[PDB]
């Protein structure tokens, strides 16, 4: 039997050792964590690079000719400018009787995919969907239509000029402008939808066909940041169209009433519930528009959800919150012996008030200005410089020993 | 400049050889996950950012 202080010597070690190792279990989790997350970048960068490959292959003059020199002389005679949905739709139902799905066709692992596809061309034969999109996008290429290679980790897109907007076509089933469908038919986890151009422009399609894209699909999506700079050098000079592509989307989702999910409006740009919002969000303003009724919740934009903080906050932040200003929030504060007043006696856990105050609340910090050779100081005879913005003008920080005994 | 970190493996010839096998035989494609699979963690650190010089050198013959 130890003694009771080597007992509690021995408890201390042990209790020391296991926090060590629950650190290194955490440290061992992170690492694998991030090192599963970095497989997953390389495996979509791979998909990235196999699509841009094939791409590049879809490109060539040859393939062209070729799908062109089948292509009945009444379809040529239409201007890419009057391509219509009409059009489109009787373009696939010839494709589909006159193109045969035949999975006997042979897989050489030496011939080319461009050799591939012109055999599949001679013999008017498709070993698989994948070989049928791609004869069909070689043939929408041979009239000269802007036509975008969709894949999910495949489709078309055909942009007409009349409506300035990209119809979804699927060759296989025989969809055009049904993106519902177009998801309907794809893989079923849908994260990553992107459609590569002729010229090689790589574009973000996801919002389009996925309705799932603000609820799971953000949550379960690589970074935004991440996939922004993979699609920046990939990006289409034709900012106007990317920008009127980016408005439908935003109508399209705009047309969802609402999620059937209480814990889907947790944390959501287009939902932001009331009792998910933080301890420093508030609604400004608090006669903002209603979104909708979920189970007697209202719903509100998050842009009317905005952070406040208190005032030393935004003077931490280079703003000042405006004299004589009501605070818009009241929230708990953590403090010195104030705060643990309401620990002391619980009465008081909620009167203690900490203002909070919107940026509307707030204006642009002013640096103060030295008086007779004194530099102005904070309520405690203190300077603040967390940030240099907030030096007085005419002062100047020297970090010297005994500077102040000088 | 802004000197990336990747900077180095340009001419590393283990670094080249993978470079050359993502460039033309997708065969040879797990085998470059294979160095992945031995000690790959400043190349998958790096490889988050500043991809443009690495799909370069990819693309480089």
Same mark, same amino acid.
Request: aromatic share 10%; net charge neutral; with cysteine.
């Given at each position: 039997?130890?003694?009771?202080?080597?007992? @509690?010597?021995?408890?201390?070690?042990?209790?020391?050792?296991?926090?060590?190792?629950?650190?290194?279990?955490?440290?061992?989790?992170?690492?694998?964590?991030?090192?599963?997350?970095?497989?997953?970048?390389?495996?979509?960068?791979?998909?990235?690079?196999?699509?841009?490959?094939?791409?590049?292959?879809?490109?060539?003059?040859?393939?062209?000719?070729?799908?062109?020199?089948?292509?009945?002389?009444?379809?040529?005679?239409?201007?890419?400018?009057?391509?219509?949905?009409?059009?489109?739709?009787?373009?696939? @139902? =010839?494709?589909?009787?006159?193109?045969?799905?035949?999975?006997?066709?042979?897989?050489?692992?030496?011939?080319?995919?461009?050799?591939?596809?012109?055999?599949?061309?001679?013999?008017?034969?498709?070993?698989?969907?994948?070989?049928?999109?791609?004869?069909? $996008?070689?043939?929408?290429?041979?009239?000269?239509?802007?036509?975008?290679?969709?894949?999910?980790?495949?489709? $078309?897109?055909?942009?007409?000029?009349?409506?300035?907007?990209?119809?979804?076509?699927?060759?296989?089933?025989?969809?055009?402008?049904?993106?519902?469908?177009?998801? @309907?038919?794809?893989?079923?986890?849908?994260?990553?939808?992107?459609?590569?151009?002729?010229?090689? =422009?790589?574009?973000?399609?996801?919002?389009?066909?996925?309705?799932? =894209?603000?609820?799971?699909?953000?949550?379960?999506?690589?970074?935004?940041?991440?996939?922004?700079?993979?699609?920046?050098?990939?990006?289409?000079?034709?900012?106007?169209?990317?920008?009127?592509?980016?408005?439908?989307?935003?109508?399209?989702?705009?047309?969802?009433?609402?999620?059937?999910?209480?814990? $889907?409006?947790?944390?959501?740009?287009?939902?932001?519930?009331?009792?998910?919002?933080? @301890?420093?969000?508030?609604?400004?303003?608090?006669?903002?528009?209603?979104?909708?009724?979920?189970?007697?919740?209202?719903?509100?934009?998050?842009?009317?959800?905005?952070?406040?903080?208190?005032?030393?906050?935004?003077?931490?932040?280079?703003?000042?919150?405006?004299?004589?200003?009501?605070?818009?929030?009241?929230?708990?504060?953590?403090?010195?012996?104030?705060?643990?007043?309401?620990?002391?006696?619980?009465?008081?856990?909620?009167?203690?008030?900490?203002?909070?105050?919107?940026? =509307?609340?707030?204006?642009?910090?002013?640096?103060?200005?030295?008086?007779?050779?004194?530099?102005?100081?904070?309520?405690?005879?203190?300077?603040?410089?967390?940030?240099?913005?907030?030096?007085?003008?005419?002062?100047?920080?020297?970090?010297?020993?005994?500077?102040?005994?000088? | 400049?802004?000197?990336?970190?990747?900077?180095?493996?340009?001419?590393?010839?283990?670094?080249?050889?993978?470079? !050359?096998?993502? #460039?033309?035989?997708?065969?040879?494609?797990?085998?470059?996950? !294979?160095?992945?699979?031995?000690?790959?963690?400043?190349?998958?650190?790096?490889?988050? #950012?500043?991809?443009?010089?690495?799909? #370069?050198?990819?693309?480089?013959?």
């Amino acid at each position: 039997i130890e003694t009771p202080e080597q007992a @509690k010597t021995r408890e201390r070690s042990e209790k020391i050792k296991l926090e060590f190792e629950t650190y290194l279990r955490r440290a061992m989790k992170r690492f694998n964590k991030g090192v599963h997350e970095d497989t997953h970048k390389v495996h979509l960068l791979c998909l990235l690079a196999n699509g841009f490959y094939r791409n590049n292959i879809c490109s060539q003059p040859d393939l062209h000719a070729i799908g062109l020199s089948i292509i009945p002389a009444r379809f040529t005679r239409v201007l890419p400018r009057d391509v219509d949905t009409y059009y489109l739709s009787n373009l696939v @139902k =010839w494709f589909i009787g006159t193109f045969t799905v035949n999975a006997e066709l042979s897989a050489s692992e030496q011939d080319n995919l461009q050799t591939t596809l012109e055999r599949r061309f001679a013999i008017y034969s498709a070993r698989d969907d994948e070989e049928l999109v791609h004869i069909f $996008l070689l043939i929408l290429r041979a009239l000269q239509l802007l036509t975008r290679l969709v894949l999910s980790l495949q489709w $078309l897109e055909v942009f007409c000029e009349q409506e300035e907007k990209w119809v979804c076509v699927d060759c296989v089933h025989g969809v055009v402008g049904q993106p519902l469908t177009c998801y @309907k038919y794809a893989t079923k986890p849908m994260t990553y939808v992107v459609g590569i151009d002729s010229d090689g =422009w790589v574009r973000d399609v996801t919002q389009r066909y996925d309705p799932v =894209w603000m609820t799971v699909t953000r949550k379960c999506r690589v970074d935004a940041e991440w996939w922004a700079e993979t699609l920046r050098p990939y990006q289409s000079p034709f900012m106007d169209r990317e920008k009127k592509e980016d408005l439908e989307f935003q109508a399209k989702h705009m047309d969802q009433p609402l999620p059937t999910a209480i814990g $889907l409006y947790k944390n959501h740009p287009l939902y932001a519930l009331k009792r998910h919002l933080l @301890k420093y969000e508030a609604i400004y303003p608090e006669t903002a528009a209603i979104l909708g009724y979920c189970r007697g919740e209202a719903v509100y934009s998050r842009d009317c959800v905005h952070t406040l903080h208190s005032r030393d906050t935004w003077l931490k932040k280079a703003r000042v919150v405006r004299l004589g200003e009501v605070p818009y929030k009241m929230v708990k504060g953590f403090s010195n012996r104030a705060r643990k007043a309401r620990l002391a006696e619980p009465q008081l856990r909620e009167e203690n008030d900490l203002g909070l105050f919107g940026y =509307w609340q707030t204006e642009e910090y002013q640096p103060p200005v030295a008086v007779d050779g004194k530099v102005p100081r904070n309520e405690f005879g203190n300077v603040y410089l967390f940030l240099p913005s907030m030096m007085p003008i005419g002062c100047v920080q020297l970090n010297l020993p005994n500077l102040h005994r000088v | 400049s802004g000197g990336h970190p990747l900077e180095f493996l340009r001419n590393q010839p283990q670094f080249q050889q993978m470079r !050359q096998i993502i #460039q033309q035989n997708p065969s040879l494609l797990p085998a470059l996950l !294979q160095q992945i699979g031995r000690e790959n963690p400043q190349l998958l650190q790096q490889i988050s #950012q500043h991809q443009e010089h690495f799909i #370069q050198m990819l693309n480089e013959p």
